[PDB]
Design a protein around this ligand. Structure first.
Ligand SMILES: O=C1[C@@H](O)[C@H](O)C[C@](O)(C(=O)O)[C@@H]1Cc1c(F)c(F)c(F)c(F)c1F
Ligand SMILES: O=C1[C@@H](O)[C@H](O)C[C@](O)(C(=O)O)[C@@H]1Cc1c(F)c(F)c(F)c(F)c1F
Ligand SMILES: O=C1[C@@H](O)[C@H](O)C[C@](O)(C(=O)O)[C@@H]1Cc1c(F)c(F)c(F)c(F)c1F
Ligand SMILES: O=C1[C@@H](O)[C@H](O)C[C@](O)(C(=O)O)[C@@H]1Cc1c(F)c(F)c(F)c(F)c1F
Ligand SMILES: O=C1[C@@H](O)[C@H](O)C[C@](O)(C(=O)O)[C@@H]1Cc1c(F)c(F)c(F)c(F)c1F
Ligand SMILES: O=C1[C@@H](O)[C@H](O)C[C@](O)(C(=O)O)[C@@H]1Cc1c(F)c(F)c(F)c(F)c1F
Lengths: 155, 155, 158, 158, 155, 158, 158, 155, 158, 158, 158, 158
């Protein structure tokens, strides 16, 4: 069970600064924490991680997952959450569970961050938990897919 | 470690109808699922559940948790999320982790549901996962408190 | 038929002043008039009346009616019309006809009274007829419930 | 009493399709039902019916009623509800009761249907009861006109 | 010099009621007052008056004045001032002076009366003077046309 | 196929004012060009032309097309595009393809021209090609109708 | 004169959270200070205190004051200031002076705090003086009541 | 019968430039044209003219006319029309006819010019006629005062 | 303590127009009443009064108070409350307590009066008590200053 | 004439998702149909196709067309229609006809799709005809180019 | 060249506090720095400085410059940037280069500071560089005026 | 000092047309002018230039500069100024001075150009001086960096 984790613009800069709202934990460290979570719960998942500052590369990537062996996507589209109708359209046609994560609470900052076109397209949205948000999303992804598979077999 | 779970207006009507967006699982069933999660992960938590259709009873309850042995609150304020400045003010003065859950994705419905005064006051917000959202919040609550306790002891 | 009549905040103050914008008839008198409209029409309708200033009591009451032997609700949610998404959510799950009444025309007053969340969730809305609006809702509820019965019997024999 | 019943744009297309959002009863049938509600109630009421797709014909008609022997208007201005300040201006000078009816609940549809200029100028508004709304307006108009008569006689003897 | 005076919806109801903001003077009386003004100042104008409650009849009429011997239009489009893009488009193509009159001050009533699509298309707008507004417009019309004729001859 | 071409307010004034933003081609010339487009394509199309400055005349004509011999409508509602919910409602019940045409690009002018109630009710909208837009609407209409027909025989056979 | 002091949601949490934006003075201490202000001014005022987190309890209390022994109300509706048309409606029918107090300046915080439905229904509003605001409301209330009374005897005598 | 004519900010710059929307006629020339109008119609009025770029001087001036022998005010508050609640409050308490004039059509320019707080307080508003607007206002002022005087005497 | 009282545009016209919404009490009378309030309270306060219709004169005066002998400002900026960011900026740098007063309740009039830039810059705002508001501002100012001073000696001693 | 066809984000996913709102026809099939439309019309047109999910790749391509051999552009910018001022700016300096196409009617979907920055920069916009829209854009482009050319020789000769 | 430097409301309070958001340099010091930037660059520029809190004095001053021997204006209109259509109107008729300066970045503060009417009328705007912004405007004005001179001479010899 | 100069979408098209709204100087020429302003001022500044139409390349580039030997950024984000929260986020974490430049005055054009997310995150913004704006940013960056150095040395010896 391959889960694709997509990390949007500026997420690669975690650690390398603004620790007063994001922390000194890096993105590579968050990805280690996700692997730890997989093993600690013995969840049968194999993660692939992708970060980019390009809207088009996020779109290419979601598209590429269509009819691939990726069963689900966990995404933090970064500032593109608030602006990217194109990424939301891509999420809409993905044909699999997509879950949005934000490290910060996007209801609790500037007004321009409240809208998320991408989160409106996702099955579910997690915000405000920092790095832990991504393990939260892993957990949901497993339950969502297992549940979908029960509807498969028992039909 | 007592965690208070507060469930707002109409949450008691889960099961008893609109299963086409909320499902036939009842609120009492969600609370059983949370207990199952506690035992299955052997988390040292003791939950207390409270449901009400009164804004004032949610406020009384959050207030009552101040300087009590409740260490955290998981809340689904229901339709009061979008309207209740009074509940948000209560959340602000609670002095402990508060986490908001919604069964549905509130970015993906009517425009009047997008605002959450209460979620803006909470540390973190979870939406769109159905019943599972509450186990997601349990998991965050444990990590948040454990982490706070590390900052306690190692200081 | 048991019909439940819910009267929201400040409706109990009818005729205990503002005899200009609302008249000098009391809530108790309006309810008497409704009873008299049933009795006179020989309608098989038992009315039950509930006034409250509490949003949560209105939701409690609408919830209580689910799986009860109430066939319908006539509601004036008062000021909560404009603000209560919670009461609209309760109406949406009521599973029975709910008719909203306002004594005044809420299109013809302050801007803040124009939105009615509860009204939008109700099948039908009556406004600006004063106390008469409640007798209009009675007439409507009876006709709605008859229609519903005839539809239900005529489908069960097919 | 002569009551004038004005039916605005596209109301003539009732039952000539969209049998889902509006039903399959025709405008002619609704008017028959209204006639039958008068006859059956032995109401001293003569109904006159007017449908038009023209804003100017509706205003002409409301104007024509001033100093006429029409005692009241029941109006469904259709889409002109939301846009016609001109028809609201005509209602405001009508000098007689005007009741607005909508078959559908205009609080529960597209945003552009929520404003009713004409509704705000009418004494009272009924919406979301389908064809029944017209019989509800009839009931109301009769009661309004009675009240008006009793008030007028009881002041002239004082 | 023919001047067409166009009077919009409900103007025919002047006198016949709401004298508490419009007065007991009728529309036919305003048209007499305009003729009085023509003779009293010995202005070489011949007025034609047209009232209608139809948007389409106002449009037909303005159109009909194009390449006619009407040299100018004085118009009170009534409630169509606030709504009629079609009447404004007609005014725009009229090819002659058009002047808007309102009996009431439309900056000083409801918010829905503040916009005038038609007045924005007119050369000039007069409001708030009652019946006198129309003699004011007559006076401007004469000066405007005389001035245009000076630019004609002296070119 | 009889196709109805409805032209809204002021369209009759083409080539008789504003050579700048519109053309110097008249409305009659546009209609000749459309006829020419049919005849030389040897299309089996009989065009019917109707211009009016009256909203209600447009609604009358759309209604008259219901259950008629007309298989489609090409419409430029003029300034009523932006204002007429009534005409949009008529389009919604037309029961046949309706194509909206504008000479000008309505996304690129005043803010008040951007909304088209009528365009949102139409299946397709063409704008900003000038008189050519109408021939584009003819091409589309023939193709829509041929596809619709091939579909009705595709289905009657399974 | 009995004066009623109504304190809305969370006001009971003063001095038990957020020393920063509010004080460290408790609600009971504020109430002692008001009593102290009366007693030392030798004012003939009997204060009655009521705090609640329930909108409906506030409306109940305002209503209960109609035709009672209370001559005035000093109110801080808390967050319900910004949301409660219901409480504003209650204030409008109170029939006696109602003064709104806020500890903080509600013009100088979040945008959602700027509106006060309740303040607009009150005769006067005091904000941003902290606990002192309540003593200012006491001073005003005594002066309003004394002026009102002197006026009732000014008039009965001519 | 003294009529005060108040001319607001930048009106003194008429002539001295932007003749492509205002013309080469100066303010002093407009005031001569008003005197010409008085004599030509033999109207018993004595005008006083005041121009200023100060909001406070317009307010002082309107105030000063209260209980003076000024019977009416014709005002072009300039850009202060759109912004000056203080000037509108002054107009409201003036106790005599006040008429607003604009040389340009303020419904037909930028959106920030559409509001006129001052015109909403005035009895009537004239726009879009250039210099002639002020003679239009003179004419209305005479009729308004004469009419008020008929209501005086015949009462 | 010298306290400066700044009165904005049109405040000088009190009692010389609109007996209705304002009083019939003049501005000079209000100023006498304030002096009277000080003298009878045996407050050590020397009031200085300044009225102007000029925004820039208000800003000049607030600035002139910086590093002066004045310990506080009571201000009614009149219509400039709603418009003057410049005056709000001046208030922000004043370096001493500034209290805003309105005779009327600015939450309960036209929409354009609701914003107060100046009020948001002031520590506290009093509205809708009429001339009494000014005596309330005096009471508050003395109390604010006494508390501030007691604090400066509370701190120099530890 | 070489005509460039630019297809924006997700257009490559046609027929590989959402048979409902779009077709089941693929992007390559649409491009074949356009080629077919040229060849059978014996048009002298050489089409060049470019799809990308990158805003900057669209801007690169429009720029690359400046002073190139391409005489026109047919563009569907996809979701960038609603967001991309950058692409609109590129269109504005393109120096040749640019036609915008949408498969769907963007006036009739979510509010966020209504604006098209790119459409307002284009000379003409076609929407809501599905894949046929592209052939309509081809017809228009040939006609625009032929008219432009006839004009350049109309003018060089006087 | 004579360049006029206009400093609007509260700019005289620079360095007389808020040493945090604005710094501790005075207006007089900034003007000294500008003088020193001229002297050091051996620029043939005479600077004239004017500060005022009066909107009317700023307009007077800009008007006074018309037909004067001032070749340019550097203006910081302070809070009047956001509100003064009157000062923008004066700038528009100045007939010479006008550059707006703000010490702070007005895009990065309260919403009410984002609009600059005066800035929109100026050729160019500089913000968020503190006192340096004035030296930047000096550099720009010199370069603008040189360019203007070279253009004027090189056209007069053609 | 190494200063990085980022030029956003369509800036490469300068002087390759719209010689009216933007002039006929090229991007390459502007960069030459900047180089010449350094050389002539004998500034110890090495300029590096980067143009791109890709939002992601601009973010990549700003990120690349973190922990590099670039001391500062001069940026014109072009149309991405108004839309890119992503580029603003990159600016906010740059940890070095970033100055925004626009050739045109973005307060004086379409409404959609008034917001600058990137500008608000930059320390300072320059607009409406054409190519000169870049030399103004150079002057500023040098002065900013000097100030920063003097501050840093004078604190390390304390
Ligand atoms: O014409 C309208 C709508 O424009 C209006 O919003 C509701 C409305 O007034 C009502 O519910 O009665 C009416 C609804 C309506 C229609 F919109 C319509 F198109 C019809 F053909 C029709 F028969 C009909 F009843
Ligand atoms: O009537 C209108 C406008 O009101 C609409 O905005 C565009 C519109 O639908 C179009 O571009 O076709 C049309 C434009 C228009 C006109 F606005 C107009 F005034 C004419 F005289 C005319 F001939 C014409 F074509
Ligand atoms: O309850 C509120 C706010 O919601 C309101 O905006 C201001 C308010 O009315 C005031 O300043 O008095 C009050 C402020 C306020 C609180 F918001 C609050 F959470 C408290 F615990 C409290 F004690 C308190 F005073
Ligand atoms: O000048 C104003 C108004 O513009 C403001 O809205 C209220 C206001 O600040 C107050 O209530 O004190 C004040 C009200 C006001 C006036 F508006 C006014 F015109 C007066 F002549 C007057 F005496 C007066 F007090
Ligand atoms: O990309 C889009 C939308 O974002 C745009 O609103 C309409 C749009 O430009 C059109 O109707 O052509 C296009 C619609 C659209 C999609 F939104 C989309 F996700 C696809 F996969 C697709 F194939 C498609 F055509
Ligand atoms: O790209 C843009 C605009 O989107 C922006 O609003 C102004 C802008 O940032 C500026 O004035 O520098 C820049 C203006 C602009 C362009 F919009 C453009 F299309 C060009 F080709 C160009 F060379 C150019 F400079």
């Amino acid at each position: 069970m391959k889960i694709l984790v997509i990390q949007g613009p500026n997420l690669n800069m975690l650690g390398h600064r603004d620790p007063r709202l994001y922390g000194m934990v890096t993105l590579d460290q968050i990805h280690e924490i996700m692997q730890t979570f997989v093993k600690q719960g013995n969840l049968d998942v194999e993660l692939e991680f992708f970060q980019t500052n390009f809207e088009g590369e996020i779109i290419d990537k979601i598209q590429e997952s269509v009819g691939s062996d990726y069963e689900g996507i966990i995404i933090n589209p970064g500032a593109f959450s608030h602006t990217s109708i194109a990424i939301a359209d891509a999420i809409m046609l993905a044909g699999k569970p997509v879950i949005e994560v934000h490290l910060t609470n996007i209801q609790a900052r500037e007004e321009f961050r409240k809208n998320s076109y991408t989160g409106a397209a996702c099955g579910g949205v997690i915000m405000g938990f920092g790095p832990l948000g991504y393990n939260m999303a892993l957990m949901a992804m497993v339950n969502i897919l297992a549940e979908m598979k029960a509807f498969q077999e028992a039909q």
